[PDB]
Coordinates of C-alpha atoms and ligand atoms in Angstrom, one line a residue:
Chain K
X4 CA 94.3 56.4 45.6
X5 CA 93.7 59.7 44.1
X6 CA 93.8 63.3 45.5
X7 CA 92.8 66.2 43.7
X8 CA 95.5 68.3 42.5
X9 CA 94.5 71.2 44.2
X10 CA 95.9 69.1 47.6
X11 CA 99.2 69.4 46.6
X12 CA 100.6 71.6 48.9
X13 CA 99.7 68.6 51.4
X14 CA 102.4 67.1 49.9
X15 CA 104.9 69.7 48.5
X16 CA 105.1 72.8 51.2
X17 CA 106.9 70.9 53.6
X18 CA 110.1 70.0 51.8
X19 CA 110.4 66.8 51.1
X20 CA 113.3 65.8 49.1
X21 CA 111.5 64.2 45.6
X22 CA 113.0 62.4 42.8
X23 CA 111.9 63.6 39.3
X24 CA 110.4 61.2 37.0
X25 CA 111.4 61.7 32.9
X26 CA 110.8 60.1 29.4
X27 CA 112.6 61.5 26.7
X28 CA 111.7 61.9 22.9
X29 CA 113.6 59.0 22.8
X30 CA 111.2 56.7 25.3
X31 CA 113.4 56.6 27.7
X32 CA 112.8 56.7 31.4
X33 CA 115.1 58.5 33.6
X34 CA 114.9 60.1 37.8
X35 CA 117.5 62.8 39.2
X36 CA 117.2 64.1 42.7
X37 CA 115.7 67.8 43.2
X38 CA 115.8 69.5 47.0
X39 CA 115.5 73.1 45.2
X40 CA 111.9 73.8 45.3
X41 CA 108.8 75.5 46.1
X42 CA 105.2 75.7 46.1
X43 CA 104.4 78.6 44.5
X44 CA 100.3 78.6 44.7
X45 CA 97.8 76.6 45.9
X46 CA 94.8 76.8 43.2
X47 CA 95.7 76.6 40.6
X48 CA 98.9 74.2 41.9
X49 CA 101.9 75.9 40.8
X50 CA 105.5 74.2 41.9
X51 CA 109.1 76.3 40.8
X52 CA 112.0 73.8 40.3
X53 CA 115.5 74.0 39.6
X54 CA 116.7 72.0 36.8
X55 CA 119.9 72.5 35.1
X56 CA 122.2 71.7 32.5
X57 CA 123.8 69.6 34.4
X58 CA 121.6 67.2 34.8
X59 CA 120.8 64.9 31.4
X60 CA 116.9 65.0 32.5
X61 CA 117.2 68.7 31.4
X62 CA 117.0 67.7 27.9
X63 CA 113.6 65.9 28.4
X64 CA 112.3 68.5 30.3
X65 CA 113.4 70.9 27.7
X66 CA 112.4 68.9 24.5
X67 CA 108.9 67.4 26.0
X68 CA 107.7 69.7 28.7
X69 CA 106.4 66.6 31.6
X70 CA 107.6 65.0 34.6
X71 CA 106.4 63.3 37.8
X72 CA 107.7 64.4 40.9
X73 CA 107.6 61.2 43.0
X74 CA 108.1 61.1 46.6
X75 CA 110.0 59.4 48.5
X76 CA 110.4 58.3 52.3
X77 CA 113.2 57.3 54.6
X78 CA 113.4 53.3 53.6
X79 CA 114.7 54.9 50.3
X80 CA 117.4 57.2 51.5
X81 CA 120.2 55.8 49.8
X82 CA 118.3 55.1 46.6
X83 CA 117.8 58.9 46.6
X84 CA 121.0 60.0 47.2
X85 CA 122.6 58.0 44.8
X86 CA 120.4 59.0 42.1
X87 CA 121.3 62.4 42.7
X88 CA 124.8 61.2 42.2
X89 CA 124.8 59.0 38.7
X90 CA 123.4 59.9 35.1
X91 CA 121.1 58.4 33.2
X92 CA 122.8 59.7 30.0
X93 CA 124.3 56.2 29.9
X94 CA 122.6 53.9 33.0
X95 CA 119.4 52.8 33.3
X96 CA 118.4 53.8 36.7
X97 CA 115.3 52.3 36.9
X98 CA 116.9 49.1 36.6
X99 CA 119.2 49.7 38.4
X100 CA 117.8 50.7 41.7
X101 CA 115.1 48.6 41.5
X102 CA 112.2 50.9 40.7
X103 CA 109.0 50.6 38.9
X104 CA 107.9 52.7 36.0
X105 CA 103.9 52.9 36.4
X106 CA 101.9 54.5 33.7
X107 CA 100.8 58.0 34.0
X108 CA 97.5 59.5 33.3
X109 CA 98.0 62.8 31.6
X110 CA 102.3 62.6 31.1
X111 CA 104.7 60.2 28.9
X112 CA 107.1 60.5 32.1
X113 CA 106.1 57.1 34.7
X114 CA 105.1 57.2 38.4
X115 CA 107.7 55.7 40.5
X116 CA 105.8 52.5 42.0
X117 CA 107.6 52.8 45.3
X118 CA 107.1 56.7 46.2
X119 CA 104.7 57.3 48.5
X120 CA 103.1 60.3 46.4
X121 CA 103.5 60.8 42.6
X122 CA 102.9 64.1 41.3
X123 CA 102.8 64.3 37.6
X124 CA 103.5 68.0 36.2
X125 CA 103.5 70.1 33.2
X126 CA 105.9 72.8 32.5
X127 CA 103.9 76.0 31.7
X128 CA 106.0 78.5 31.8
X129 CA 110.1 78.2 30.9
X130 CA 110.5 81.9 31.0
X131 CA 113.2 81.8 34.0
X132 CA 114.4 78.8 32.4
X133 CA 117.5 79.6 30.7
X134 CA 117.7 82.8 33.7
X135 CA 117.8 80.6 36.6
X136 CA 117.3 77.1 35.9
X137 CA 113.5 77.8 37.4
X138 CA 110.3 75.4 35.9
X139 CA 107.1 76.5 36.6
X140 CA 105.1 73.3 36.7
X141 CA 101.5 72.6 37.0
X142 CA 99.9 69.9 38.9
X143 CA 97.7 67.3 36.8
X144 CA 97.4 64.3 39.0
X145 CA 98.4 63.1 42.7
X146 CA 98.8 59.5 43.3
X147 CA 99.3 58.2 47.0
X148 CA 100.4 54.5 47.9
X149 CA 97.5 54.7 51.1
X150 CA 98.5 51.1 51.5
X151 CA 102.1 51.6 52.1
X152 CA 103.8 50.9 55.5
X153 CA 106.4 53.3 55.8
X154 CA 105.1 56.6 55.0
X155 CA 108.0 59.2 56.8
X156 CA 109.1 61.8 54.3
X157 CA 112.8 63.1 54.7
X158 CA 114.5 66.6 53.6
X159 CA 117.7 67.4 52.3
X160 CA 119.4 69.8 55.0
X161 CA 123.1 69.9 52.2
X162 CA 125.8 67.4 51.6
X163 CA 123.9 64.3 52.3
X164 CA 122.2 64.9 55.5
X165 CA 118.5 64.6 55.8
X166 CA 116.1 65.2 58.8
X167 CA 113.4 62.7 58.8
X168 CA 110.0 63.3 60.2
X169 CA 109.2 63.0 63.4
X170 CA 106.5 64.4 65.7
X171 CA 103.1 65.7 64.0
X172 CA 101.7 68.9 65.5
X173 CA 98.6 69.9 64.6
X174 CA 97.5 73.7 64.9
X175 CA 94.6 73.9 62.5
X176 CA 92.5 75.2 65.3
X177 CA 94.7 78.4 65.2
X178 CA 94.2 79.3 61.2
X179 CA 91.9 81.7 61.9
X180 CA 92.6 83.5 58.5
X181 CA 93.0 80.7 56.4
X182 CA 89.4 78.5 56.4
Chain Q
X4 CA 127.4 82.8 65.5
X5 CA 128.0 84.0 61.8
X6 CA 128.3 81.6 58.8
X7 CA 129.5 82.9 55.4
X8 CA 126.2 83.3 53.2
X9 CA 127.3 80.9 50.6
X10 CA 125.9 78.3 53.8
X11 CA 122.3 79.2 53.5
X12 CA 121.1 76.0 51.3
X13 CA 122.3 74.3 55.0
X14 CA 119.4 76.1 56.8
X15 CA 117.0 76.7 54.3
X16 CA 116.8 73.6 51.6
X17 CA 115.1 71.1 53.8
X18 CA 112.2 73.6 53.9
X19 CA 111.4 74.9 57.4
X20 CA 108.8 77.3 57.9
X21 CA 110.0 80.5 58.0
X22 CA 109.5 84.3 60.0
X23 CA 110.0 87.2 57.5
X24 CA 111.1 90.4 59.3
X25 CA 110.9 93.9 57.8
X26 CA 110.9 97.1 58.5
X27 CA 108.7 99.9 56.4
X28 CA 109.7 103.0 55.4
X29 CA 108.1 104.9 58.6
X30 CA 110.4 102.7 60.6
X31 CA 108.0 99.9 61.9
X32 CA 109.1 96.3 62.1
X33 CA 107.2 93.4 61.2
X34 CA 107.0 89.6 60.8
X35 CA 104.9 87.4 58.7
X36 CA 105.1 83.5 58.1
X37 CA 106.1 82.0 55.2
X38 CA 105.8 78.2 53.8
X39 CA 106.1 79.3 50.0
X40 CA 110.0 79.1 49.4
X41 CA 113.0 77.3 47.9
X42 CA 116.6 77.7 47.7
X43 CA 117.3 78.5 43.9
X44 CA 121.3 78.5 43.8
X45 CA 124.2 78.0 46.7
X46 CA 126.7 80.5 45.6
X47 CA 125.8 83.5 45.2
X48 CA 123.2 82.2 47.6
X49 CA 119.6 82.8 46.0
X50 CA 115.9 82.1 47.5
X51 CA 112.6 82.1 46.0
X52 CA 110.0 83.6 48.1
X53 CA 106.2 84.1 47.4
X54 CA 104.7 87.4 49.0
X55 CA 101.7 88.7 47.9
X56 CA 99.7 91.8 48.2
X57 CA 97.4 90.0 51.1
X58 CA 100.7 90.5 53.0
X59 CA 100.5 94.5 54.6
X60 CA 104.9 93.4 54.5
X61 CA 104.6 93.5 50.6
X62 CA 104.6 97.0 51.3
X63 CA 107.9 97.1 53.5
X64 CA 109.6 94.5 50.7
X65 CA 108.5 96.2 47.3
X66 CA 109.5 100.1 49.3
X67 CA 112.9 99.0 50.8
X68 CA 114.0 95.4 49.0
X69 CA 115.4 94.0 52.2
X70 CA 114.2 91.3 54.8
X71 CA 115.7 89.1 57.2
X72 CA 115.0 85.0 56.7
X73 CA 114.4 84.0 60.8
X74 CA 113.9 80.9 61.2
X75 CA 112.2 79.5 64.3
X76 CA 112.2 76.3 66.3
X77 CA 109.4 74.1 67.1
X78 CA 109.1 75.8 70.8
X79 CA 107.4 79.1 68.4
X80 CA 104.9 76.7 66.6
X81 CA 102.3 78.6 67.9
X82 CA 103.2 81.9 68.0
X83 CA 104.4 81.4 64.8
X84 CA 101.2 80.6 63.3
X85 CA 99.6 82.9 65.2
X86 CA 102.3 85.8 63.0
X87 CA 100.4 84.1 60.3
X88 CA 97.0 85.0 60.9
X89 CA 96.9 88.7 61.7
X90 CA 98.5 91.5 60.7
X91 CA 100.9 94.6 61.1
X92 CA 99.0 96.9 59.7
X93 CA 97.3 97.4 62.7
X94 CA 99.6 95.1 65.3
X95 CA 102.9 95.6 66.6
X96 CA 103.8 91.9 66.4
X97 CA 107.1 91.8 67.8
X98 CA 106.0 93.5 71.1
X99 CA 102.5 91.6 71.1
X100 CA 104.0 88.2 70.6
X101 CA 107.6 89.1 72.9
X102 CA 110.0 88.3 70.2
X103 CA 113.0 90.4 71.0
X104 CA 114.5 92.3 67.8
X105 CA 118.3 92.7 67.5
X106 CA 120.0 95.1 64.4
X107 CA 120.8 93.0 61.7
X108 CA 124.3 93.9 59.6
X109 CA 123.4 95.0 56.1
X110 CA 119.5 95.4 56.3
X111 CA 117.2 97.8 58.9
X112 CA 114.9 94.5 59.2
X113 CA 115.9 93.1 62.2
X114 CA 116.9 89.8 63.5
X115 CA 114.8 87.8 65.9
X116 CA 117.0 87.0 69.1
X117 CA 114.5 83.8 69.9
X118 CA 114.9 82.6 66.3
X119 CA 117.6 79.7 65.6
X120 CA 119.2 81.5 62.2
X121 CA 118.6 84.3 61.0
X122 CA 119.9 85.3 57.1
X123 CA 120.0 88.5 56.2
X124 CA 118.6 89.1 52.4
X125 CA 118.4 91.7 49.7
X126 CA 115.6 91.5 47.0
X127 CA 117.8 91.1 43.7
X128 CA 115.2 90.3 41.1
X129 CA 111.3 91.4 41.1
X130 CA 111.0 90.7 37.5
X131 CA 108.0 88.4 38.6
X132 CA 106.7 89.5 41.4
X133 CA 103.9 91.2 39.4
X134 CA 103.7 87.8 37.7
X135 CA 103.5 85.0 40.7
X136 CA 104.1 87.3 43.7
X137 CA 108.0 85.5 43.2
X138 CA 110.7 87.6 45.3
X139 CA 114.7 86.8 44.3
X140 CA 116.7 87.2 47.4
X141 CA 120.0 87.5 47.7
X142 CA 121.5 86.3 51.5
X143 CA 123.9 88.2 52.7
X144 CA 125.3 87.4 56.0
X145 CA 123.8 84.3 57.8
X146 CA 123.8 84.5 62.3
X147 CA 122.9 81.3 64.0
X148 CA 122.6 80.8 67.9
X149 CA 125.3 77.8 68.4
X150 CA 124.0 77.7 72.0
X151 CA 120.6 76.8 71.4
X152 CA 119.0 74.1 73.2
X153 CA 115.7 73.5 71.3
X154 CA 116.8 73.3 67.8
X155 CA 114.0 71.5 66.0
X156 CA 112.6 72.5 62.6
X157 CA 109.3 72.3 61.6
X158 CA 107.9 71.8 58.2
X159 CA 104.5 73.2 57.3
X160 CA 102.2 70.3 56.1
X161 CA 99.2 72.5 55.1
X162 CA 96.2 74.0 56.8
X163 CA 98.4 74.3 60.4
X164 CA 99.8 70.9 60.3
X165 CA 103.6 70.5 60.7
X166 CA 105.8 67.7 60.6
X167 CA 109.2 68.0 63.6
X168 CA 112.1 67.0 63.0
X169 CA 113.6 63.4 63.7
X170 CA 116.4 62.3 63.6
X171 CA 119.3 62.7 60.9
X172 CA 120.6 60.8 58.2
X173 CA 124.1 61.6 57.7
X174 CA 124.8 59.9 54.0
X175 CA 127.9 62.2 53.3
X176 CA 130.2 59.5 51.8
X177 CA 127.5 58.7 49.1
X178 CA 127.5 62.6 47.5
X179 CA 130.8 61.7 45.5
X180 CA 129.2 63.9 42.3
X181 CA 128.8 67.3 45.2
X182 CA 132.2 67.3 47.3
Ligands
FMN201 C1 120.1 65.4 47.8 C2 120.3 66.0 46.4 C3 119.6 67.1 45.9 C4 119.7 67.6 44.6 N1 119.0 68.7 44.2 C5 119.0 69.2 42.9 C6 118.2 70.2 42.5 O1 117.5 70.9 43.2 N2 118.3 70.6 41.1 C7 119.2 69.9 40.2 O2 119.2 70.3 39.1 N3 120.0 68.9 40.7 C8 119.9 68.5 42.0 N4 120.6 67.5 42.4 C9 121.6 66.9 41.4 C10 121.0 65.9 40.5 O3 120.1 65.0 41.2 C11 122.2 65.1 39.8 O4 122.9 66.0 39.0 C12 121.8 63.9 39.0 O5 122.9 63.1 38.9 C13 121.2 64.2 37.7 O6 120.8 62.9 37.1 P1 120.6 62.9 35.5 O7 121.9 63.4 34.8 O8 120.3 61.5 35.2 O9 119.4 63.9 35.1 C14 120.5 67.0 43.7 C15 121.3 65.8 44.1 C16 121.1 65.4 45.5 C17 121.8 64.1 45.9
FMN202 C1 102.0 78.4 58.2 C2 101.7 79.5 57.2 C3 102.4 79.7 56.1 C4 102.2 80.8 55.2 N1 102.9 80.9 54.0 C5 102.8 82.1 53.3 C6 103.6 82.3 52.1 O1 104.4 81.4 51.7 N2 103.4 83.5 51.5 C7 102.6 84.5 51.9 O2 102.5 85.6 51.3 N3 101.8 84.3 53.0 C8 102.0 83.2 53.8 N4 101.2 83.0 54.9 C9 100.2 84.1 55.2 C10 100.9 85.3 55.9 O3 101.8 84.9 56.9 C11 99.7 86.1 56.5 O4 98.9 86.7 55.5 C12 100.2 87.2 57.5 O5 99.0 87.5 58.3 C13 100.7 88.4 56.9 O6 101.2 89.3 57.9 P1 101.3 90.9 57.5 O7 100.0 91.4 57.0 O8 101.7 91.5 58.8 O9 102.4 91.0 56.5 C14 101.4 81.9 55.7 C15 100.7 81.8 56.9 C16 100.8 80.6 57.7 C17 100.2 80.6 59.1
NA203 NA1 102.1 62.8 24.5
NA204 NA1 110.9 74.4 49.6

């Protein structure tokens, strides 16, 4: 199912911890783990992420300007996690964990099959880039798994411990300002 | 309860909501709600915060470059949206709402006794808040209330919805890249 991209703060605000989704110049498919981020407008959708040297997917974000932020929920915890503590400069981590690439519509970089939500993004603007290690990505598409079972979304709190959802509450009725 | 500032990615990466305090130039206080933020580094400790102009505490931040970072519990849910729809231009929202404010350190914003943390925060970069009404800040002493009973987060969702916090995932022994 598809939601407009305009919907991802529905998605993003909250905090979820998200695996990012790359393809080289090279073709190939990578994921790293990113809890520093932001939404940074609704309309258009706007997202600042921290991506650093550090990390190999820095070079296809550099060189090719596309991801997907997919996702993830609690019955991938440990997949997360150890993503965000491997490199795909010399493992295939697809493979590996057991994830499926899915084509995208408007990015080179895949939708993880298993991620709940798949976000895919364009960098437009890399002037805080080489400053702080901040993207400015652009929302192009937003893919949700409707079918899936387990849909609870978990946050990174630091040093491997995450919160998972719990309890919905549901003050709409007081957003007065914000119709 | 003080924790050296260095700690803030502990409080603020998993994305709660968010109080920001200030206090203008005429000596008014103020809070405001905030979804729109990320941690951006852990040491120095640096946040990304979007305040715009729609904000009457854009005023307080762009004439005195300091708030304080209070973050609530899910006992506030509704008061704290209810900081989010009105405004201190005309309101004096601490009294109206009877949140108790207690003299922060290094800033004249002041802490909010009812909040869980509190982090106390210079503005250290506007270079684009013209741009994408982006704020750097800069924590600099972090207080938390060790006693406190209640100490939910919530996550906004969007449009008033918020997701509580569950229960924890401790995955520690997996972060073998981050010790
Ligand atoms: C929970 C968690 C959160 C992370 N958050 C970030 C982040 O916000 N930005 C970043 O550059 N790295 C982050 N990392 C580190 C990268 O995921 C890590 O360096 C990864 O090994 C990079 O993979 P790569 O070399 O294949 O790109 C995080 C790791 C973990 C486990
Ligand atoms: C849940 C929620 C999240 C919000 N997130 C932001 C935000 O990230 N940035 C912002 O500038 N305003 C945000 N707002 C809007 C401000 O809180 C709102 O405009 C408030 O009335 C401003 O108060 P002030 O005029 O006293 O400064 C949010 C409001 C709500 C209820
Ligand atoms: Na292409
Ligand atoms: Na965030």
């Amino acid at each position: 199912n598809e939601l407009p991209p305009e919907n991802a703060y529905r998605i993003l605000e909250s905090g979820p911890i998200v695996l990012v989704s790359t393809r080289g110049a090279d073709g190939r498919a990578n994921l790293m783990t990113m809890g520093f981020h932001m939404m940074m407008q609704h309309e258009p959708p706007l997202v600042g992420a921290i991506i650093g040297p550090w990390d190999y997917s820095h070079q296809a974000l550099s060189e090719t300007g596309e991801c997907v932020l997919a996702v993830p929920t609690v019955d991938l915890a440990e997949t997360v996690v150890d993503i965000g503590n491997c490199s795909g400069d010399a493992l295939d981590k697809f493979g590996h964990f057991g994830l499926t690439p899915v084509p995208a519509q408007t990015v080179d970089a895949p939708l993880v099959r298993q991620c709940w939500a798949n976000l895919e993004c364009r960098v437009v603007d890399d002037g805080w880039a080489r400053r702080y290690n901040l993207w400015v990505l652009e929302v192009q598409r937003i893919w949700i798994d409707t079918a899936r079972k387990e849909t609870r979304l978990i946050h990174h709190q630091g040093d491997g411990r995450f919160s998972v959802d719990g309890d919905t509450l549901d003050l709409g009725e007081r957003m007065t300002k914000w119709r």
